[PDB]
Design a protein around this ligand. Structure first.
Ligand code: K
Ligand code: K
Ligand code: K
Ligand code: K
Ligand code: K
Ligand code: K
Ligand code: K
Ligand code: K
Ligand code: MG
Ligand code: MG
Ligand code: MG
Ligand code: MG
Ligand code: MG
Ligand code: MG
Ligand code: MG
Ligand code: MG
Ligand code: MG
Ligand code: MG
Ligand code: MG
Ligand code: MG
Ligand code: MG
Ligand code: MG
Ligand code: MG
Ligand code: MG
Ligand code: MG
Ligand code: MG
Ligand code: MG
Ligand code: MG
Ligand code: MG
Ligand code: MG
Ligand code: MG
Ligand code: MG
Ligand code: MG
Ligand code: MG
Ligand code: MG
Ligand code: MG
Ligand code: MG
Ligand code: MG
Ligand code: MG
Ligand code: MG
Ligand code: MG
Ligand code: MG
Ligand code: MG
Ligand code: MG
Ligand code: MG
Ligand code: MG
Ligand code: MG
Ligand code: MG
Ligand code: MG
Lengths: 150, 103, 109, 141, 117, 54, 48
RNA sequence: GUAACGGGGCUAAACCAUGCACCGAAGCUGCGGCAGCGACGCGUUGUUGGGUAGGGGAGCGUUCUGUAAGCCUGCGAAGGUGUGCUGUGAGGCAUGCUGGAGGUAUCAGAAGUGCGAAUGCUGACAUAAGUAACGAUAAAGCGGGUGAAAAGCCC
RNA sequence: CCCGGCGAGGGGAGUGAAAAAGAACCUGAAACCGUGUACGUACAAGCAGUGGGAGCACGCUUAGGCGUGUGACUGCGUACC
């Protein structure tokens, strides 16, 4: 806190509580007793615990009929209207689409649909598999995920 | 006419028609209850005193309501000894209406 | 129909003004004006101007007649205090409060 | 709920007692009992349920032992050094009604209600009272 | 994650001040004083749930004594007599009968005297 | 010398039980002018007991 | 399986002690330090 | 200041002996309820539950992140102030009035997470009190003027 | 427009969804200070409550009582850290 180190008043004789610093945390405008500093909140996740969690999640998506496997998933042009119609045809709304290789047309078409997300198989994460209502995987994506987790 | 009977470890002086709050009975509302052990029946100058119970004395009553009484607060406090404790209490009761007194 | 007048931020403590207010509470306005005329207090001057304003309000705005009016309610509330410093001996400072009052008079028939 | 006497529906009767030859303190306990209403089934601690009692011949009340000469009544005037005393015999000569009144007052509850109870005691030095209109019943203590 | 205390602090103080309604002066107005008053009121109430049972029994006994002595027997002999007669009517009821049914009370005294004779 | 305990609003009020002002009992009326005045004082218009004194 | 239907294993998340937060906590006032002496003090205690 | 029975009073209402009654506690019993521990019928039985330092266990509520582009909300959010109901407690719920735009279930996650004290810190407001005092005891009086008003200004 | 000193301040009128949004301006807590009403209180002794409890007032209405406020009288009772 900005200010002098001068003792505000003498130790004895004034009839006031003893003071030492104008910056005392007891005082208005004083320091914070246990002032925060920038923190790293990241945790270690054991590799096997990470992989074990993904296998649990994927297995539960299958049991709940939230994993949908397709042969191919793509759009003709980078047009949001095309992807929106395709998902309407499939009865999909809130969907994570996992491809073996992420198409530029499908990327751009999905970007302005907040319910939709398009990933490569390498970019799966545990929260996203749980967060979206349905997960659409291409056949090629399933093999890469199989190979990744084993 | 009145009679005296025991229920819920306490005694009650009752007449026909009056509602009496007792300790909780395990008897559904609407059902009849009979208090078989009558300590006294006084019709007028006719006074039957049980020794301890009046022979053939029965009070019949209908269970009107079950409920919980007014909340009482328990406060415990030991000054200068850093000890305080609070607790609430509501006592269960059964209300019964006296339907018949028969000596 | 009740008619009000107020003097807000009047320069007097409420305690002093209330001494005068208590003289006229419930009186006919003609009697109240006479009482205030012969009360030798600064607050009598302040209260009399508020009462006269309330009467004028009642006649002009509400179509009353002075003959029927009584002082139905009167009260003095504490206004903001002005804080001032008074030097005392040995370099010590005291706070002076210059107290103010809000005077309300209600007249009605 | 247990019965409580009500001040405005209490039945208070009038009695007359002759103090002649009665032992002071044994008379006083019976007066105190009846002024409080401890003799009634409607007795209620916070209510004066007691009776009005006339005491005649207060100057002829008896005491045992050497108390007539040796029993001392002390009081202080509130002025420093103002401790005063009178023997029983001096009290009987000067102010005989005070002997019974003092004895009874000390046996009544302390506080407003006890003072109210004491107002029902009417003590006389001699054999006559002015309360024929109240029709007091004779009471043998 | 800074937490301001005002809303919760106000609710706690108001809860205490509500329980101090009717108390004199600072005891119904000032939190510090009201809090002490409310704790003490709780301490007394706990104590007096026990004292109430003592005070009522004391009252019933005094009234039974008066009613018994009007019928020519002391409380202590009366209770002994009822116990020897196997009468189990408690003091709350005896005191109630003493006030409200004088004739029934006399019958109880006669039962007690007969058991003693 | 100073208080050991803060006096109450009750005690403040009790002390002030003698502070109330007394209104003038009644005004007198000049015989001539009809003006109300304080008894034994001249009127606002300078009358006293009927005579234009000032 | 949603982000608002996941729970930790029973026993896996014990709440930390919070000293000096009133009588009911059991760690109010002195905060488990007892009364006075070097060990009660901030920074207090002897070396290994 | 009685002042060496707690008092009144007492010749027993004292003392000794014997006896039977009664009063008397949060003790014991009765009735209703809650919880801990010991065996398991996941039945009910035995028993326990005063506590400072202190150890152990289990919770309430607050702000913030996700769940939430969800849900509630101008047909009235938060906050304020009443009232009723409710739980063993921290508390919770409902609703009148005020308010006039926000709030946020659930399950998780993180803490600037709970104040009556520290001659604590800041602000506000009391008390004493309409009390002390109005600052040299060189001193004022009156007439006229002006003014809403003049002991104090002007003449 | 009106009272007032061609004041301060206020009452109307008007604006506005709202003016107890009027510039001493969102909300508007608490201490503290008032006005009004109900009840208590001038023979009474102390941590000011608590247990008991009459009376009065005002609501409800099986018309039995109940609710709310007050609290005469009385047992017990020396704040907190
Ligand atoms: K600074
Ligand atoms: K998207
Ligand atoms: K420790
Ligand atoms: K609201
Ligand atoms: K949430
Ligand atoms: K402080
Ligand atoms: K003052
Ligand atoms: K009391
Ligand atoms: Mg700072
Ligand atoms: Mg790695
Ligand atoms: Mg200087
Ligand atoms: Mg006593
Ligand atoms: Mg914040
Ligand atoms: Mg208040
Ligand atoms: Mg004065
Ligand atoms: Mg401990
Ligand atoms: Mg310490
Ligand atoms: Mg030590
Ligand atoms: Mg130590
Ligand atoms: Mg240090
Ligand atoms: Mg002496
Ligand atoms: Mg007992
Ligand atoms: Mg026990
Ligand atoms: Mg049991
Ligand atoms: Mg125990
Ligand atoms: Mg324990
Ligand atoms: Mg959130
Ligand atoms: Mg908020
Ligand atoms: Mg509310
Ligand atoms: Mg904190
Ligand atoms: Mg504070
Ligand atoms: Mg503390
Ligand atoms: Mg001050
Ligand atoms: Mg003084
Ligand atoms: Mg003086
Ligand atoms: Mg002076
Ligand atoms: Mg000067
Ligand atoms: Mg002049
Ligand atoms: Mg001068
Ligand atoms: Mg001059
Ligand atoms: Mg103006
Ligand atoms: Mg706004
Ligand atoms: Mg505002
Ligand atoms: Mg009176
Ligand atoms: Mg007297
Ligand atoms: Mg009186
Ligand atoms: Mg006194
Ligand atoms: Mg009570
Ligand atoms: Mg006492």
């Amino acid at each position: 806190v900005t200010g002098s180190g001068k003792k505000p008043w003498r130790q004895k004789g004034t009839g006031r509580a003893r003071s030492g610093s104008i910056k005392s945390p007891i005082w208005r405008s004083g320091g914070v007793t246990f002032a925060a500093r920038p923190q790293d909140h990241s945790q270690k996740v054991n590799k096997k615990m990470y992989r074990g969690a993904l296998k649990s999640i994927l297995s539960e998506l299958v049991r709940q009929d939230r994993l949908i496997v397709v042969e191919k998933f793509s759009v003709e042009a980078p047009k949001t209207k095309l992807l929106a119609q395709k998902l309407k045809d499939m009865a999909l709304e809130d969907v994570l689409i996992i491809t073996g290789e992420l198409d530029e047309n499908l990327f751009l078409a999905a970007r302005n649909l907040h319910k939709v997300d398009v990933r490569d198989a390498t970019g799966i994460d545990p929260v996203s598999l749980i967060a979206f209502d349905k997960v659409v995987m291409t056949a090629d994506a399933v093999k890469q995920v199989e190979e990744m987790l084993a | 006419m009145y009679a005296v009977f025991q229920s819920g470890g306490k005694q009650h002086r009752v007449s026909e028609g009056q509602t009496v709050r007792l300790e909780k009975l395990d008897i559904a509302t609407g059902e009849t209850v009979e208090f078989a052990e009558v300590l006294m029946i006084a019709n007028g100058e006719e006074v039957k005193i049980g020794v301890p119970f009046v022979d053939g004395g029965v009070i019949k009553a209908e269970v009107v309501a079950h409920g919980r009484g007014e909340k009482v607060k328990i406060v415990k406090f030991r000054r200068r000894k850093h000890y305080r404790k609070q607790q609430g209490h509501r006592q269960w009761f059964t209300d019964v209406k006296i339907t018949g007194i028969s000596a | 129909m009740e008619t009000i007048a107020k003097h807000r931020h009047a320069r007097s403590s409420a305690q002093k003004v209330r001494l005068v207010a208590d003289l006229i509470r419930g009186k006919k306005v003609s009697q109240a004006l006479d009482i205030l005329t012969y009360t030798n207090k600064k607050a009598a001057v302040l209260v009399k101007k508020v009462l006269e304003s309330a009467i004028a309000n009642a006649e002009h705005n509400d179509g009353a007649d002075i003959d029927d009016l009584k002082v139905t309610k009167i009260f003095v509330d504490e206004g903001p205090s002005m804080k001032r410093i008074m030097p005392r001996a040995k370099g010590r400072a005291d706070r002076i409060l210059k107290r103010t009052s809000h005077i309300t008079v209600v007249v009605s028939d | 709920k247990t019965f409580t006497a009500k001040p405005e529906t209490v039945k208070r009767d009038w009695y007359v007692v002759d103090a002649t030859g009665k032992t002071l303190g044994r008379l006083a306990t019976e007066l105190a009992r009846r002024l409080r209403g401890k003799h009634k089934a409607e007795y209620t601690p916070h209510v004066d349920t007691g009776d009005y009692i006339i005491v005649l011949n207060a100057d002829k009340v008896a005491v045992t032992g050497n108390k007539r000469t040796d029993k001392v009544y002390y009081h202080h005037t509130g002025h420093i050094g103002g401790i005063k005393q009178a023997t029983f015999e001096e009290m009987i000569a000067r102010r005989p009604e005070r002997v019974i009144e003092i004895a009874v007052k000390g046996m009544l509850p302390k506080g407003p209600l006890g003072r109210a109870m004491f107002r029902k005691l009417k003590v006389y030095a001699g054999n006559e009272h002015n309360h024929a209109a109240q029709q007091p019943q004779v009471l043998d203590i | 994650a800074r937490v301001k205390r005002g809303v919760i602090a106000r609710a706690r103080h108001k809860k205490i001040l509500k329980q101090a309604k009717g108390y004199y002066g600072a005891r119904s107005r000032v939190y510090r004083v009201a809090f002490q008053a409310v704790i003490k009121a709780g301490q007394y109430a706990y104590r007096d749930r026990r004292q109430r049972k003592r005070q009522f029994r004391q009252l019933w006994i005094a009234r039974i004594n008066a009613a018994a002595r009007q019928n020519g027997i002391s409380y202590s002999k009366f209770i002994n007599g009822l116990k020897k007669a196997s009468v189990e009517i408690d003091r709350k009821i005896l005191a109630d009968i003493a006030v409200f049914d004088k004739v029934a009370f006399t019958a109880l005294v006669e039962k007690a005297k007969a058991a003693l004779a | 010398a100073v208080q050991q305990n803060k006096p109450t609003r009750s005690k403040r009020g009790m002390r002030r039980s003698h502070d109330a002002l007394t209104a003038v009992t009644s005004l007198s009326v000049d015989k001539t002018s009809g003006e109300k005045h304080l008894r034994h004082h001249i009127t606002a218009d300078g009358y006293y007991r009927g005579r234009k004194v000032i | 399986m949603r982000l608002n239907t996941l729970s930790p294993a029973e026993g896996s998340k014990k709440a930390g002690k919070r000293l000096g937060r009133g009588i009911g906590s059991g760690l109010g006032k002195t905060g488990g330090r007892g009364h006075k002496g070097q060990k009660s003090r901030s920074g207090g205690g002897v070396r290994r």
